[PDB]
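Lecture notes, unit on binding sites. The following record was shown on slide 14. It pairs a sequence with sulfite ion.
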Amino acid sequence: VEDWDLVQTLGEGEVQLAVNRVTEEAVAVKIVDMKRENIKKEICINKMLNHENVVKFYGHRREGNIQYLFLEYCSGGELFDRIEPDIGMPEPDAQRFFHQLMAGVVYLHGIGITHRDIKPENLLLDERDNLKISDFGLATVFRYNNRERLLNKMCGTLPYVAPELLKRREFHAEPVDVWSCGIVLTAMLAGELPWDQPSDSCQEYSDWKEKKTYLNPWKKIDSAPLALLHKILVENPSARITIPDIKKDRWYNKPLK
Ligand SMILES: NC1=N/C(=C2/CCNC(=O)c3[nH]ccc32)C(=O)N1
Ligand SMILES: O=S([O-])[O-]
């Protein structure tokens, strides 16, 4: 509909797999029922985007109350399903996924877009296992005519969200996306999330700020990637490593099997 057949639910709004009746071409179709401004910004952001680690936008048609965004099908599914609970994945796989995730985030930030909800559910895999960032539903412009604006809206997903965003009335966009990339890396390497939220109220978060790496997420990780996580998961956003410096990090540049 209309041209394409909607053939299977990919991830409920709902994303359908759409197979072109004629050519056999597959794409994903995202269906959003405007009766059931976020969708306007999402299409608007997607039309700016062009990069091999961001999910391709093909166009949209608005057929009534129903928006249909045609988007690159990623047949590998979600990063999330390559993370084995309590285990993670092999370190070389985590590293390559991390490199590609950084290439995508560098790109977004260079065009002044912040994703604001990076997590394994939103990180999709294509046919050759290349990661693509998806879902610009919560994305927003943080730089325009070369002037940065601070963010005020609290959004994202608690386990991934940086602590300043719970504590500051306004904060810089880029360090929040960096932090969430660090939590994704932890999840890859340990197969578990370090805390429910980065709060005062949260025992495991206090444990980390006190450097108790003999405790569980951290003791599964290993000293080179763990040293990088020490630089990303810094509570103060001004002392947190930036992406140019992530690129200089020793594990980041370690050749892996
Ligand atoms: N979170 C999110 N996932 C999206 C898609 C659309 C992009 N391509 C897909 O293959 C897909 N599979 C499962 C979900 C999706 C999407 O657009 N946002
Ligand atoms: O424990 S933190 O300061 O990396």
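Take-home: The pocket of debromohymenialdisine (ligand 1) is lined by residues 10-11, 15, 28, 30, 55, 71-74, 122, 124, 134-135 (CB under 6 Å).
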